[PDB]
Every structure is written in structure tokens, then in C-alpha cells.
Structure 1
Amino acid sequence: ALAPEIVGEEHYQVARKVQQTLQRYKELQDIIAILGMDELSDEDKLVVHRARRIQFFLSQNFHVAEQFTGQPGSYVPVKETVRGFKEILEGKYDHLPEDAFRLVGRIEEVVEKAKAMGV
């Protein structure tokens, strides 16, 4: 179903660009693992910086996970999630700590967590 005529051009482009960024981040890890991230070019550092946040934002808190963690779950519409991922890709949240993207619902809750963390 991931086709431009089925989910929409915006959704298709956002999903494809997220996949491209994650795939690019996949190869750079060994170079980052041995040599410092300073060895990477300017664009590669931004790619890593945004890929970490994309990976953490892919996670979500479930309603059924209450018995495990105690944190209430959330429901995220597809429009909300594509808007949040588009904003992350364009880079309007590059200054927030990466830990604020973990186990979170909508993109506004990420800002809320960052403010609770002292941003």
C-alpha cells in the first residue's frame, strides 16, 4: 500500500526520506564506532543527528504496556505522525535532547518532555 496514489504524495515522500536517512545512518555506524564523528563530513553529522531522533521517535507507548511500565498509552493519527516526521526531517527540533523522543506519542509531547527535562 506504500504507493503515491494510495497513501498520498506527501506521505510517500516523507516515508521514503525517513527510510533513506535511516539506511544512510546504517553504514556510518562502524566509522563512527572506531573514529570520532568529526571524521564525518558536515552533512553526515546532521544525518546522524536526525537519524537518532527519528529512531527514538519511532517508538511509542502502548495502552497494554501499562501493566509493564505504568506510563499511559496514546493514539496517534497518521496526519499527526507524518507532520511530526516531516518537521523532524526538516530540522525544527534539532536542539532538543534525543532522550525526549523515547516512548512518546505526538510531537507536542516531545516538546513537553523536553521542557520537563529542563530545555
Structure 2
Amino acid sequence: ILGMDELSEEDKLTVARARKIQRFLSQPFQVAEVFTGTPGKYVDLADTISGF
């Protein structure tokens, strides 16, 4: 409605971190390599926990 200008920068921090988390959940698939463009990744559990 407004446009992310009236949020006191503790809400803008979690908006930016949540957008980073929203993108970082997406992962290419080795069965969707023929769909879009990308060789698929297999993330380990330790790498997942450390990255998030």
C-alpha cells in the first residue's frame, strides 16, 4: 500500500533478510535442468543449516 518507507529500519532489516531467505529457499533441480537453464544442485544438511 505504502512502499517500504515508514518501517523504522528494524522492519526493513527483516524485510531484506526475508527476501534473501525467500530467494535462498529456491534451488535448481537436476530433473528441471531441461526446463529452464540450470544444472541442479544437491545441498547438504550442514551446508543448509550454516547458510540459513
Q: What TM-score comes out, normalization by structure 1 length?
A: 0.42
Matched, 1:53 2:20: yes
Give 1:76's aligned residue: 43
Q: What TM-score comes out, normalization by structure 2 length?
A: 0.90
- Unaligned ranges ≥5, structure 2: none
The aligned amino acid for 1:57 is F
Give 1:35's aligned residue: 2
Aligned pairs for 1:2-17 (under 5 A) are none
Give 1:65's aligned residue: 32
Aligned-pair identity in percent equals: 69
- After the TM superposition, list the runs of 4 or more consecutive aligned residues in structure 1 that deviate by more than 2 angstroms: none
Greater share of helix residues, 1 or 2?
Answer: 1
Q: CA RMSD in A?
A: 0.9
Residue correspondences, number: 52
CA distance in 1, matches of 2:45, 2:3: 37
**In 2 relative to 1, CA 40–65 (structure 1 residues): closer, same or farther, beyond 3 Å?**
same
What SS does structure 1 have at the residue aligned with 2:46?
helix
The aligned amino acid for 1:76 is V
CA distance in 2, matches of 1:66, 1:36: 36
